[PDB]
Amino acid sequence: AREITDIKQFLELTRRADVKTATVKINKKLNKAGKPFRQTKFKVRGSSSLYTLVINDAGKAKKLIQSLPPTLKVNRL
Amino acid sequence: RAHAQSKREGRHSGYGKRKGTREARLPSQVVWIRRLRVLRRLLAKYRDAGKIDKHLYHVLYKESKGNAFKHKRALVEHIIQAKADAQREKALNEEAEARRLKNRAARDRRAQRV
Amino acid sequence: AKRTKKVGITGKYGVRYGSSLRRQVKKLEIQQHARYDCSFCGKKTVKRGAAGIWTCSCCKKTVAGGAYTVSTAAAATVRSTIRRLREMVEA
Amino acid sequence: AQRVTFRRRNPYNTRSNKIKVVKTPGGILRAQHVKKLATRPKCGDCGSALQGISTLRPRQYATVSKTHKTVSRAYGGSRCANCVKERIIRAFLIEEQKIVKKVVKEQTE
Amino acid sequence: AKTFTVDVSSPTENGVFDPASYAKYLIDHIKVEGAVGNLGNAVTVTEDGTVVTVVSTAKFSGKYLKYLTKKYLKKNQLRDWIRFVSTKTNEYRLAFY
RNA sequence: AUAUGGAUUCUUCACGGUAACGUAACUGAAUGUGGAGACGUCGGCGCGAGCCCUGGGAGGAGUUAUCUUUUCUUCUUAACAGCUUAUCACCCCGGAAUUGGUUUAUCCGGAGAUGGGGUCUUAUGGCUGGAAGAGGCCAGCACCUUUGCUGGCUCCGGUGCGCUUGUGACGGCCCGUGAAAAUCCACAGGAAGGAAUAGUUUUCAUGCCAGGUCGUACUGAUAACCGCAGCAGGUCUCCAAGGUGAACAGCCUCUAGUUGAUAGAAUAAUGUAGAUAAGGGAAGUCGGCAAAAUAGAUCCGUAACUUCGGGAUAAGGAUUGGCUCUAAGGGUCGACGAUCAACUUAGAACUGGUACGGACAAGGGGAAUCUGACUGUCUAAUUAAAACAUAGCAUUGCGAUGGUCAGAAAGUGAUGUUGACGCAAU
RNA sequence: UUCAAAUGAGAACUUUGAAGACUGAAGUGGGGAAAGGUUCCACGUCAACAGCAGUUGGACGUGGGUUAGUCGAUCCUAAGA
Ligand SMILES: [K+]
Ligand SMILES: [Mg+2]
Ligand SMILES: [Mg+2]
Ligand SMILES: [Mg+2]
Ligand SMILES: [Mg+2]
Ligand SMILES: [Mg+2]
Ligand SMILES: [Mg+2]
Ligand SMILES: [Mg+2]
Ligand SMILES: [Mg+2]
Ligand SMILES: [Mg+2]
Ligand SMILES: [Mg+2]
Ligand SMILES: [Mg+2]
Ligand SMILES: [Mg+2]
Ligand SMILES: [Mg+2]
Ligand SMILES: [Mg+2]
Ligand SMILES: [Mg+2]
Ligand SMILES: [Mg+2]
Ligand SMILES: [Mg+2]
Ligand SMILES: [Mg+2]
Ligand SMILES: [Mg+2]
Ligand SMILES: [Mg+2]
Ligand SMILES: [Mg+2]
Ligand SMILES: [Mg+2]
Ligand SMILES: [Mg+2]
Ligand SMILES: [Mg+2]
Ligand SMILES: [Mg+2]
Ligand SMILES: [Mg+2]
Numbered sequence: 001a002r003e004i005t006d007i008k009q010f011l012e013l014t015r016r017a018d019v020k021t022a023t024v025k026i027n028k029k030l031n032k033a034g035k036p037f038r039q040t041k042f043k044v045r046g047s048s049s050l051y052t053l054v055i056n057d058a059g060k061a062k063k064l065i066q067s068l069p070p071t072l073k074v075n076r077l
Numbered sequence: 078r079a080h081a082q083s084k085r086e087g088r089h090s091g092y093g094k095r096k097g098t099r100e101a102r103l104p105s106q107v108v109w110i111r112r113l114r115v116l117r118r119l120l121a122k123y124r125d126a127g128k129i130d131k132h133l134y135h136v137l138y139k140e141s142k143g144n145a146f147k148h149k150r151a152l153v154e155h156i157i158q159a160k161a162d163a164q165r166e167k168a169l170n171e172e173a174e175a176r177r178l179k180n181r182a183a184r185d186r187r188a189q190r191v
Numbered sequence: 192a193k194r195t196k197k198v199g200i201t202g203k204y205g206v207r208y209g210s211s212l213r214r215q216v217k218k219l220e221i222q223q224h225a226r227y228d229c230s231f232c233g234k235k236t237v238k239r240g241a242a243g244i245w246t247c248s249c250c251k252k253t254v255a256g257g258a259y260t261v262s263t264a265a266a267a268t269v270r271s272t273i274r275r276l277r278e279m280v281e282a
Numbered sequence: 283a284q285r286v287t288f289r290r291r292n293p294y295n296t297r298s299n300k301i302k303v304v305k306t307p308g309g310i311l312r313a314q315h316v317k318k319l320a321t322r323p324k325c326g327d328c329g330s331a332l333q334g335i336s337t338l339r340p341r342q343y344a345t346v347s348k349t350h351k352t353v354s355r356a357y358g359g360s361r362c363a364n365c366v367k368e369r370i371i372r373a374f375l376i377e378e379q380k381i382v383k384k385v386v387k388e389q390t391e
Numbered sequence: 392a393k394t395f396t397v398d399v400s401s402p403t404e405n406g407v408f409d410p411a412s413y414a415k416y417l418i419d420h421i422k423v424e425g426a427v428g429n430l431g432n433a434v435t436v437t438e439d440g441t442v443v444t445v446v447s448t449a450k451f452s453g454k455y456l457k458y459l460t461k462k463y464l465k466k467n468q469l470r471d472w473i474r475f476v477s478t479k480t481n482e483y484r485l486a487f488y
Numbered sequence: 489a490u491a492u493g494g495a496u497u498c499u500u501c502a503c504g505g506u507a508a509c510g511u512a513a514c515u516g517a518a519u520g521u522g523g524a525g526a527c528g529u530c531g532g533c534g535c536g537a538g539c540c541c542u543g544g545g546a547g548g549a550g551u552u553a554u555c556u557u558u559u560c561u562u563c564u565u566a567a568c569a570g571c572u573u574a575u576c577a578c579c580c581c582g583g584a585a586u587u588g589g590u591u592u593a594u595c596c597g598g599a600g601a602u603g604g605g606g607u608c609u610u611a612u613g614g615c616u617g618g619a620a621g622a623g624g625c626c627a628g629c630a631c632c633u634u635u636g637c638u639g640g641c642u643c644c645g646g647u648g649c650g651c652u653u654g655u656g657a658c659g660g661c662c663c664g665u666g667a668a669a670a671u672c673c674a675c676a677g678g679a680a681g682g683a684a685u686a687g688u689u690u691u692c693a694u695g696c697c698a699g700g701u702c703g704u705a706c707u708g709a710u711a712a713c714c715g716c717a718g719c720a721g722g723u724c725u726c727c728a729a730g731g732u733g734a735a736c737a738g739c740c741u742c743u744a745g746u747u748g749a750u751a752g753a754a755u756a757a758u759g760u761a762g763a764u765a766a767g768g769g770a771a772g773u774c775g776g777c778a779a780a781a782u783a784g785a786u787c788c789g790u791a792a793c794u795u796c797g798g799g800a801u802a803a804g805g806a807u808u809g810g811c812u813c814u815a816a817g818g819g820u821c822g823a824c825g826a827u828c829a830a831c832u833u834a835g836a837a838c839u840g841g842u843a844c845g846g847a848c849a850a851g852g853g854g855a856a857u858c859u860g861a862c863u864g865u866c867u868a869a870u871u872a873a874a875a876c877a878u879a880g881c882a883u884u885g886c887g888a889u890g891g892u893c894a895g896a897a898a899g900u901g902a903u904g905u906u907g908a909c910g911c912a913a914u
Numbered sequence: 915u916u917c918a919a920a921u922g923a924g925a926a927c928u929u930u931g932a933a934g935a936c937u938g939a940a941g942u943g944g945g946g947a948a949a950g951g952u953u954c955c956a957c958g959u960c961a962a963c964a965g966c967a968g969u970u971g972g973a974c975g976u977g978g979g980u981u982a983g984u985c986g987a988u989c990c991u992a993a994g995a
């Protein structure tokens with residue numbers, strides 16, 4: 001299990017021709033001030049490693065869900 | 078919890094409640110390590126803060142390795158007394174050199190007018 | 192303070208083994224636990240390992256020596272004799 | 283307090299049977315068998331631990347890149363920097379002394 | 392300031408309960424700094440007929456509120472019919488069975 | 489097995505840093521070298537983990553005549569991966585006596601200390617991914633079945649001569665210096681093979697395939713083993729809560745487990761085991777056998793003799809509870825101020841059927857004689873001793889074509905991986 | 915050790931519940947090595963065994979159960995053979 005931080009790297013990983021499954025997990029964490037925000041984890045199942053991109057911006061998360069390839073088995077929740 | 082609170086207030090600690098030796102209850106080595114570590118960290122703090130110079134620090138470090146000091150209060154009072162004595166000596170030497178300079182100036186002007 | 196009048200390092204043996212044996216052991220234990228001058232770096236850092244091995248904690252040089260002293264008097268005499276004979280052979 | 287058991291059939295507290303007590307995500311205490319600790323590779327000249335070289339069990343060195351097992355110098359992960367420098371100085375000085383000894387022999391005849 | 396609410400509507404509508412008495416018990420028995428009855432501008436206990444509200448700036452907790460409520464129910468033999476149950480955080484109710 | 493990407497090459501087989509060294513890579517045959525594998529024991533100290541103790545809060549359960557913001561309980565985070573994180577060690581500047589730095593433990597410094605700035609090992613810890621979706625604790629519904637769900641919380645600390653364990657830097661000890669090999673890596677070297685309408689690189693990343701065979705249940709013992717048995721015997725080891733207490737002692741309790749020993753009714757003698765006893769106190773007896781007395785801790789005090797180390801807890805005395813106080817002994821932050829924190833010691837008053845190491849736990853002592861110096865060892869199943877051993881002392885043989893001793897013999901063997909400071913025999 | 919219920923022809927001994935106790939973490943707890951070899955588990959079941967009893971059992975009868983590239987053996991060498 002590895003964590004990634006580059007959106008471009010994550011999009012490249014989503015098309016690596018061995019990634020056939022991803023999952024989108026929604027967490028309800030607090031942003032160090034008590035405000036309940038929405039954290040989105042994108043987990044792409046590589047052949048050897050599970051790559052996780054953590055996005056604390058719900059808007060960028062929605063944009064990434066829209067930009068995910070349509071043959072990825074996105075597995076919301 | 079109630080018994081622990083009573084012991085914290087100091088009950089149940091008399092001679093009739095002790096079954097191990099004083100060393101068994103609390104090692105004198107542990108007590109000495111605590112004392113020497115507080116003395117050494119106080120000396121290092123004073124040296125770093127400039128309250129003492131490295132030579133007085135070395136003398137007091139050797140003295141604290143020797144017993145020579147019952148506690149932190151004793152070390153602080155000894156430092157105070159040592160610094161007071163040093164200041165006294167310095168003031169005495171300053172006054173002696175000032176009087177020597179005054180006498181030399183008087184001699185110089187006397188010779189220049191004679 | 193002086194903790195023992197005469198037993199010194201042999202105070203660990205208590206009252207056992209006899210006073211003469213404890214004295215004989217004391218002399219050689221003092222010799223074997225003494226710190227010696229390093230002939231290579233000039234520091235008082237040579238200590239015994241096993242018997243006959245003397246290592247300097249500084250410069251990490253180990254010399255073969257006596258069982259309980261760095262240099263036995265017999266070995267010093269042999270060194271002087273060998274130096275003299277080498278000088279006679281060379282000249 | 284929760285008590286643990288060995289996970290292998292070895293019941294003896296040998297060097298290869300060391301365990302740590304860890305808490306699992308299931309909330310319970312469990313022994314985890316820990317491999318023997320690695321030893322730092324050491325200089326072949328002075329015996330000190332070699333700086334910059336990873337400390338791994340012997341066969342783990344086959345699973346790491348060359349960068350973990352060497353240092354960019356004349357003897358890499360074999361000799362330390364001070365011993366390499368001493369080797370350089372000794373080699374240069376002794377070759378120079380060989381040259382001067384040769385010329386001394388030639389000019390003493 | 393922390394708020395703790397207790398929904399007494401079920402046992403008050405089922406007859407055997409007195410929200411006013413329960414609140415009065417809360418003021419009389421809530422301790423501040425070890426002393427009882429000294430709720431000076433630090434603990435407020437208000438009533439609506441169905442929801443007892445406690446607002447506290449001093450040391451107070453839902454555990455203490457449950458302890459006092461259980462003490463009151465035991466005093467009024469209201470246990471084994473009424474349970475102090477937490478629905479949401481700092482929101483409790485008196486379940487009646 | 490492999491194809492891409494990445495990297496390298498027009499100066500072919502990389503760049504950066506003064507350096508210690510860094511990295512995503514960054515050719516490397518024979519041969520050689522080095523490292524890891526790979527190592528004792530004890531002691532104190534530092535740190536980590538788990539446990540213990542404990543505060544706040546979010547839930548559940550218990551007590552509630554009275555008191556208790558209370559008692560118990562859940563609040564957890566694996567292997568692996570990325571970033572980061574040490575002691576030690578090393579590097580650059582600099583040249584230090586008014587010697588400095590420094591450990592609990594006294595070692596280090598012109599062979600370059602202190603100091604300033606850096607490098608490194610990643611035990612270990614922190615954050616993140618794994619991973620909250622898991623597990624845990626609850627709540628609200630419904631249930632002919634499968635029981636089905638639907639929600640909420642699973643958080644933030646503190647403390648330490650604490651226990652267990654791991655580890656680090658040290659120190660003590662030896663006429664004791666405390667395995668080997670498989671295996672893996674590195675280095676030296678430069679054989680060889682390498683670029684320009686192009687070469688190199690499976691120690692960089694990703695990607696593909698496979699990983700066989702045998703064991704795996706259970707007990708591991710007051711019933712699964714051995715002892716003729718479901719035998720009070722014997723049989724190696726790991727984990728290890730709270731209190732009291734020096735303590736893995738004894739006693740009580742938590743989790744877990746058990747409640748299994750043929751039973752019932754009486755309470756004679758004599759028994760087995762446990763105890764008490766007026767006055768005397770070994771008069772018993774071969775003999776103080778047995779039992780009793782003493783016992784912890786604090787303070788005082790301690791002889792002959794001695795190998796000066798001991799004897800010694802010599803002997804012989806006093807105190808000990810509870811409660812309320814007092815004093816001393818610290819950390820952090822900026823002579824003091826603020827704040828935080830844990831026990832150990834000393835003292836005082838008060839108090840009681842003068843009790844108080846209140847159960848448990850726990851030396852009897854002294855004056856001498858014989859004997860063996862001591863620690864240790866043996867007659868398993870009648871002898872533990874003064875017997876044996878021991879260090880010490882002394883004698884003997886032997887220089888290898890040898891001494892002593894094996895073998896039926898050997899081109900055989902033990903001492904001997906040995907060499908008189910040795911081996912062998914006393 | 916005690917009370918009640920269930921089962922059963924039959925209950926001091928089985929099961930469940932309640933109570934009283936103990937092992938008191940150097941355990942009467944949880945796992946293993948040697949050894950045993952199915953004693954593990956389920957169902958049926960009490961002629962014999964469990965030195966009383968028995969409806970119970972490590973018994974009797976019939977079946978089920980031991981899943982590995984990562985835990986071991988396998989490989990290495992030790993004293994030695
Ligand atoms: K390196
Ligand atoms: Mg102690
Ligand atoms: Mg001491
Ligand atoms: Mg590069
Ligand atoms: Mg320095
Ligand atoms: Mg680690
Ligand atoms: Mg241990
Ligand atoms: Mg098993
Ligand atoms: Mg088992
Ligand atoms: Mg067992
Ligand atoms: Mg048998
Ligand atoms: Mg205690
Ligand atoms: Mg009598
Ligand atoms: Mg009497
Ligand atoms: Mg008498
Ligand atoms: Mg008589
Ligand atoms: Mg008589
Ligand atoms: Mg007689
Ligand atoms: Mg007797
Ligand atoms: Mg006495
Ligand atoms: Mg005596
Ligand atoms: Mg004897
Ligand atoms: Mg002894
Ligand atoms: Mg016998
Ligand atoms: Mg006997
Ligand atoms: Mg004898
Ligand atoms: Mg019975």
Ligand SMILES: [Mg+2]
Nearest residue numbers: 747929930931
């Ligand atoms: Mg029962």
Ligand SMILES: [Mg+2]
Nearest residue numbers: 739936937938
């Ligand atoms: Mg008992």
Ligand SMILES: [Mg+2]
Nearest residue numbers: 740936937938
């Ligand atoms: Mg008990």
Ligand SMILES: [Mg+2]
Nearest residue numbers: 954955971972
């Ligand atoms: Mg069975």
Ligand SMILES: [Mg+2]
Nearest residue numbers: 964965966967
């Ligand atoms: Mg029978």
Ligand SMILES: [Mg+2]
Nearest residue numbers: 960966967968
């Ligand atoms: Mg029968």
Ligand SMILES: [Mg+2]
Nearest residue numbers: 953973974975
């Ligand atoms: Mg059967």
Ligand SMILES: [Mg+2]
Nearest residue numbers: 290984985986
């Ligand atoms: Mg294995």
Ligand SMILES: [Zn+2]
Nearest residue numbers: 229232247250
């Ligand atoms: Zn030296």
Ligand SMILES: [Zn+2]
Nearest residue numbers: 325328362365
């Ligand atoms: Zn070196």
